């Protein structure tokens, strides 16, 4: 009995899920786990079950964009997911400090989408679970990988025009660290459906992927998923 | 030197483009053509040059959702596309009149997204080009396929909640025909970058509570229109 | 039994109606038809029945402004009108291309009013019926009159101040052709009440009437009304 | 050299102006005066110089609706008017207390228009000048005409629909007295251009569900106030 | 039986109430009346009953800020207050004309708060009662004290940042006289609960207290309260 | 040279500040410390330097409400504060789970104010610093005090009306724990001025329909956290 977009079953959904933008990235992640079980591939949603450090968790892709990743997150949350960690890339809003290849672990986001607003009034915060943020940070410490922490702007516009000015400059003076396209949506949906969420991002651009740094980030994401998967096993 | 997301080059972009959501649909479309050439497949964006009735145009996937599809449309418009037609599925907002399997060709859309709003004020209409619309309707007549016309609601929310009421009921009473997730964004981006746009949709569901020959028909109409439109660019 | 503002009866309303801003313009239009029947004149609303090319249709005035023309359109739509075509003047938002005296046939509009927003959420498009737009364009071809096509900004402000900046510059970079004060309102009301609407405008100003060009525009409007009136006779 | 819409010249504008919606009302008002002079009639704008109690002031029509009347008010304010009083009709939002034929003199209005918002932020109040208000009320006392005071809702929507609920019910509970279509716009334009404004209204209807002597009385009060106010401009 | 924040009883509330920002100011006001009766002091809300010119009225403090003064005004209005006059300080938005120490009597305000908007749609005017404004002005005439009249901007921001621009410049070109932080809130709450309100302010700053001028302002406020208290005695 | 409202000087501001609403609460807190020094009392702002566990930090009152408390937070942040913890009371929005007397330590807030919006766009989150949050939670563990975590609604409206429905019901369904009037403003101001913030609240009421030892416990936790945090500033 299958989920409309993900095309996996309720009983295939693990408590912990690592989510990812590029479907290609699922393939490159499962290959560094102890083993894996391919589950489904429909549209941009590729589902693979990972086995790492004695634990098991899904890794699922959602494509680019809040509306498309919302479908993913809703299907996960309405069907037994308890923890969802986003691993992806972003641009830097503090180019003096946060540089290409740097890793950012985020605790909150700017809701520059539409879905979240159709779900709850705009005054509501897009904010992550602390345990998840704490686990991610602690893993980065163990693995001896320096990270930044901060707020991400989650904006549905990648390409600005010359008519309405972009708000990236504002949000950067407001001390937002980075910009991507999915994190706020995950956070709001998670809060609404009692799922614990978090975000780890690698800087790939300076709108204002370094091979070994990407490998570190993935180690952190996977470690954190395994650490949190323990509490549910 | 390649487009950041689509991973094709400016020269590979034909004047007319057919756009679809599901990357799987690109492969089902290309075999209905006379011949084709695979160009690229990056993330949710699969690119293929189609050859139909002596004409040559791309077919490109954009995934689900306004933000993800805006990246596709922008890369296309900034690099030479002149006509972009969306072909996809949708839900009925008129379940007494418009039923699972029916085809709707839309002239305008409700902007229930965000990208379009980060680009111009919300008071600005999401409209399609009337030639594209007219071409689509005329193909539907030549191929003897009955077809609805109307307005689509393009909403970023597929799965509603119990706190903020959905606006579908509202837009239904306002005579919006049909609901999906991409058309408004296409239209506004097309208008701002001087690209003619249009959309054709097959009803796959009824959110109030795919037919193979009808899907085949819709693809036929879409491909027919693309060819007719490619004709006027030598 | 009379309509509250128009002061005509249900049975006096024809399927096709040409609407116009200046009440004076009704008088100048009826005089170039084959014959006419004056119906009423209340406030700014002058109603005259026209007979042209074997067809009959109302021609009605509504004054300047969205709130006042809404009353007109609502009384028409709630009482049997099936097609309403707006004929009027506008300013140009592309002064290099669209010049004083030029004719523009419009398919959609910017909803810079209030009525439409009190009727339906702002995300809803103000857009015309294609058959109407097609008929208008085809008439312009027959009569050998070159026209432009495009989006009109319908704005309730004619006179800007120096505090809030006008959006005309924005909407012009957005590729809007022209600016007037009624078209979006007609379009939204029409869509809401299953009436087919359209707009033909003559450029009279460059905010950013050429005697023979006005005569052409009126020929087009009247031809189009007669062509569409046929389908209902 | 004439005003674009009103078709009168700057010199023809008197310090005090009486404004009305119906162009037909201008003609009914001028004959109640001592004498008058027709000035112009263009579109919905009819202009007449009135002479009442040794005083001289214009009476001008503006049609229905905020956008159409804003053009009138702006042309007047930009060219020398100092006081503008609106006299017109309205509906009751307090049908137990305020009944068909009653007269209301309003100090402030709800801005349910658009023009005012394209001119300043919505947080800005639509208020009248208190002298004008006071003069109107004092005339009502001298002429022994009972009168209500309160806030008017100025709404661009006369004919509501079944999709977006009207806000009249709301504003009624908020103690707004009365409803019409022009006052808010007058007030805001007056405030921005340093012109003193006021309004007096006769109730012609009850949108929840014209009395000749009451209308005569209201016009008397309006003309009385205009004369008293024209007095202080030599 | 006591009010939740003010900690006074229904029967202690007089028909007329003078309200004030600084709790310290209550102490300095009661001392220039004929006599007084201290009632309560809870949080920032100090309540004292004043006896002046044969009349009696409360004088109550509410602190700085719309949210905090709303609590005060609601407790007063829901418990028998009929007239509430605000006496306080403000900055000047017309620095050429309205100078430090000048007195302004206000009839309306810009609703740059949140409470009023949670109570009623933003299109609703924040406007005072005329009798109150008239009384205040007439007292200023008797006492031979020159005053200004105008609209006050009531804004919840005292300290602007460099990201979103302040609207004070706009509201000043719009001909607003002064800026403070409570008046619009009083006016809206008053209108909603059939209480007559008014405002008298002394200019203390030029964001864009003169000892004898403050004394004048207080004389005016007190006179006006006594004059209005008569109608209810 | 003194701060305009707080009436203390830049040098008197310690890196860590404890903030409370009720000026009366400052006096009840200082006596629970090892020693203290009164600094100032102006309007609703009472300032006192506290000494607890060898550490030194201010305690300052800010009255009720976002606008009044923003003045306090801004004066503190502009003049050297590094950590600001809010300790106060609140209502339950989860009355089956969170009961009168329970303590909630909040990580984030709903921005139902205005100040925060005049400072940055509403899409920006009101979040606390996670160290502050973590410190507070750890103190609660050391002192063996059970404690809730969650999101607070910070609303400028204490007394709702019958015209515009309150949004508490909504935010409750959205899993907001608790409701008060200051936290969102603190958080946003902290984020914009690079100051770490947090909040701890005791439930005093149930707006759907103070326990002394629980209040004592909450103050203990707050003071404990302040000391632990002051430690890292020599
Ligand atoms: O500089 C950027 N701006 C906006 N999005 C992204 C991204 C992420 N990558 C995808 C689009 O490039 C999308 O998933 C977004 O979240 C990386 N860098 C940037
Ligand atoms: O009933 C519907 N609601 C919203 N979207 C869709 C669609 C289309 N399919 C995809 C998601 O189901 C998306 O691209 C959307 O445009 C088909 N039916 C519906
Ligand atoms: O340049 C213009 N700006 C705004 N409206 C108009 C108009 C039209 N004429 C009337 C006001 O001048 C009104 O009906 C509007 O629709 C002509 N030119 C312009
Ligand atoms: O009940 C009413 N609702 C809205 N407007 C009006 C009016 C006035 N009459 C005109 C339209 O009926 C218009 O100028 C408006 O201001 C009288 N009664 C009502
Ligand atoms: O220049 C000013 N701007 C904003 N508020 C005030 C005030 C008033 N004083 C208090 C804050 O300084 C507050 O009650 C506000 O209403 C005096 N001057 C100004
Ligand atoms: O149930 C409540 N709603 C709103 N505020 C509060 C408070 C706090 N107490 C003060 C007002 O009662 C204010 O500072 C607010 O933050 C306790 N309980 C509630």
Numbering used by the authors:
A (entry chain B), C (entry chain B), E (entry chain B): 3 to 210, 221 to 245
B (entry chain A), D (entry chain A), F (entry chain A): 3 to 211, 221 to 245
Copy text from the publication.
Crystallographic investigation of the triple mutant PfPNP with Tyr160Phe, Val66Ile, andVal73Ile in complex with the transition state inhibitor immucillin H reveals fewer hydrogen bond interactions for the inhibitor in the hydrophobic pocket. V66I:V73I:Y160F PfPNP, a P. falciparum PNP mutant designed to mimic TgPNP, retains wild-type PfPNP efficiency with the inosine substrate, but has significantly reduced phosphorylysis of MTI. MTI is a poor substrate for the V66I:V73I:Y160F PfPNP with catalytic efficiency 160-fold lower than for inosine (9.0×104 M−1 s−1 compared to 5.6×102 M−1 s−1). ImmH binds V66I:V73I:Y160F PfPNP more than 600 times better than MT-ImmH with Ki 3.6 and 2200 nM respectively. Similar to wild-type PfPNP, V66I:V73I:Y160F PfPNP active site residues are mainly contained in one monomer with His7 and Arg45 from the adjacent subunit binding 5′-hydroxyl of ImmH and the phosphate, respectively. There is a reduction of hydrogen bonds in V66I:V73I:Y160F PfPNP to wildtype PfPNP. The Tyr160Phe mutant is unable to participate in hydrogen bonding with water and Asp206 due to the lack of the hydroxyl group on the Phe side chain. The Tyr160Phe in V66I:V73I:Y160F PfPNP cannot participate in the water-mediated interaction with the 5′-hydroxyl of ImmH due to the hydrophobic properties of the Phe160 side chain. The V66I:V73I:Y160F PfPNP pocket in the catalytic site near the 5′-hydroxyl group of ImmH is in closer proximity to CD1 of Val66Ile (4.7 Å), CD1 Val73Ile (5 Å), and CZ of Tyr160Phe (4.2 Å), than with wild-type PfPNP. In wild type PfPNP the sulfate oxygen interacts with ImmH O3′, but in V66I:V73I:Y160F PfPNP, phosphate does not seem to interact with the 3′-hydroxyl of ImmH.
Plasmodium purine nucleoside phosphorylase is part of the streamlined Plasmodium purine salvage pathway that leads to the phosphorylysis of both purines and 5′-methylthiopurines, byproducts of polyamine synthesis. PNP catalyzes the phosphorylytic cleavage of purine nucleosides to ribose-1-phosphate and a purine base. In P. falciparum, PfADA converts MTA to 5′-methylthioinosine (MTI), which is then converted to hypoxanthine by PfPNP. PfPNP, like Escherichia coli PNP, is hexameric and a member of the nucleoside phosphorylase family I. Unexpectedly, the PfPNP crystal structure revealed that the 5′-hydroxyl group of ImmH and 5′-methylthio group on the MT-ImmH are positioned differently in relationship to PfPNP.
